[PDB]
Ligand binder design. Structure first.
Ligand SMILES: [K+]
Ligand SMILES: [K+]
Ligand SMILES: [K+]
Ligand SMILES: [Mg+2]
Ligand SMILES: [Mg+2]
Ligand SMILES: [Mg+2]
Ligand SMILES: [Mg+2]
Length: 191
RNA sequence: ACAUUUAACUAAAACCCCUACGCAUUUAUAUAGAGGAGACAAGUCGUAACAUGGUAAGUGUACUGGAAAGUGCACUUGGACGAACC
């Protein structure tokens, strides 16, 4: 996390693009001169933008820093930003028992409702001879319990030297969800 | 409920009742279906226990969880704390 607080007296860069407490642009100056300004006016230094090639810092009072920090949290409370998608992994065996496959199927369903990406890998069972067409059937068994909830983000694909398959499931988008409801309703009208 | 009659110059005859047992009661067997334990064995998912077993273990109780189990509170040592001062 990047907090909006006083940077302190030790500045990271040597050349600093400084601004005034009222927003007036003071141009670039050496950090030694900035510390002198902070002491002469009794102000604190905050970092407004870092993407710019010349580091942009601004002088502010303790009251301004509070007002900005309050403004930012209200912007998020009102317009909360979405977080990055978390990737969950599962490694199954070809000869996985049905009771255990049901346990992991219920777990995959809970990850999809939370809008996660589920990477499912299927390896050849121990002391078992299996074909890639039979291992690929487990994916459809898993995804069949989630008719209009999940779909393939990355279809089954041999990996690890052809020993194991791998796919990535995701939650259906809102447009894809309304389409499923539409197609389902059409079948209801036909039947 | 039933109630002793005849007979008696030797003495004898006569006497014969009706109500219970059931859709009651006792115990057991059979049978739809639902569970438990054990044996055989060691597939499947984990790795709970045994070493400070990788969060010391356990008891009671409560709640919770695919599964061993997890967690709270009190209790136990059937754990330990390295055994002069440093
Ligand atoms: K334990
Ligand atoms: K122990
Ligand atoms: K207990
Ligand atoms: Mg263990
Ligand atoms: Mg332990
Ligand atoms: Mg305990
Ligand atoms: Mg818990």
């Amino acid at each position: 996390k990047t907090a909006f607080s006083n940077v302190g007296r030790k500045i990271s860069q040597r050349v600093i693009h400084l601004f005034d407490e009222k927003g007036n642009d003071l141009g670039n100056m050496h950090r030694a001169n900035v510390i002198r300004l902070m002491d002469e006016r009794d102000l604190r230094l905050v970092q407004r933008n870092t993407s710019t090639e010349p580091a942009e810092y601004q002088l502010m009072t303790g009251l301004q820093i509070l007002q900005e920090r309050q403004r930012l949290r209200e912007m998020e409370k009102a317009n909360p930003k979405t977080g990055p998608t978390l990737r969950k992994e599962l490694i199954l065996s070809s000869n996985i028992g049905q009771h255990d496959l049901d346990t992991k199927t219920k777990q995959i369903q809970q990850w999809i409702k939370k809008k996660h990406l589920v990477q499912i890998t299927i390896k050849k069972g121990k002391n078992v001879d299996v074909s890639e067409n039979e291992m690929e059937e487990i994916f459809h068994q898993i995804l069949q319990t989630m008719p209009g909830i999940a779909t393939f983000s990355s279809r089954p694909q041999a990996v690890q030297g052809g020993k194991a398959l791998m796919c990535v499931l995701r939650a259906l988008s809102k447009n894809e969800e309304k389409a499923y409801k539409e197609t389902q309703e059409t079948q209801e009208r036909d039947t």
